Amino acid sequence: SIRIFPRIAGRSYIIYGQTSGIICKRMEKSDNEFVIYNYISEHYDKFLKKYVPKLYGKNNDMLLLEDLTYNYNNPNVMDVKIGARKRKSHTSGFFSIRGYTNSHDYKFDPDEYLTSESTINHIKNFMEAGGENRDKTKQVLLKWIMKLSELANDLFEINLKFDGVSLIFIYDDDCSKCDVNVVDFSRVKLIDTNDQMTISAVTNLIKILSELADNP
Ligand SMILES: Nc1ncnc2c1ncn2[C@@H]1O[C@H](COP(=O)(O)OP(=O)(O)O)[C@@H](O)[C@H]1O
Ligand SMILES: [Mg+2]
Ligand SMILES: [Mg+2]
């Protein structure tokens, strides 16, 4: 029958697709996520291609999405909420770490407000699976910085309020492959300006990751 997908965070029903390379995500509250994927396809197709998992189509209340973990032997995943929270402030000031591979072992708590030092330590914890090969882990950080920098640049020209959106960071244990993409358009709204809050989240992550990539 059905294979439940190993979600790192979130609340939605997510299962493996019937065929390889697909996950199916239930739209739990409304079809807003589908309305927004279609809006971005129509008005911002370049943003959609670069930064967002492919939407393959819809099956009743289920979105057929590109499985971002598919081509990884040993994927390590971290979900960072960069859009505004429903009614609370961010746990790390500009963003909220929602979860990561092995976070239970590090006594991580998504509800816990973090100092700058604790925020950096959890991102370091997420990177420990990448082992003691400094060079390869440095290249992972630099590839994320490359993509997030372009994203922050591109966000200045996008008139959406990115409420609730997450960055999904992924790297393989052997650090031969990594990526970062934007997911969760369930609460995204149309507006007449760019989203300065979301831009501040991304530039803050770029600062943190840059420090890690340069730190001896
Ligand atoms: N396209 C995807 N590929 C792989 N994992 C995904 C994908 N979309 C979501 N996930 C996983 O599901 C979790 C929740 O996704 P999200 O879209 O934020 O759902 P929710 O609305 O439940 O918060 C993420 O933390 C990640 O682990
Ligand atoms: Mg989410
Ligand atoms: Mg892609």
Numbering used by the authors: 48 to 263
Sentences from the paper on this structure:
We have biochemically and structurally characterized a minimalist inositol phosphate kinase (i.e., TvIPK) encoded by Terrestrivirus, a nucleocytoplasmic large (“giant”) DNA virus (NCLDV). We show that TvIPK can synthesize inositol pyrophosphates from a range of scyllo- and myo-IPs, both in vitro and when expressed in yeast cells. We find a heart-shaped ligand binding pocket comprising an array of positively charged and flexible side chains, underlying the observed substrate diversity. A crucial arginine residue in a conserved “G-loop” orients the γ-phosphate of ATP to allow substrate pyrophosphorylation.
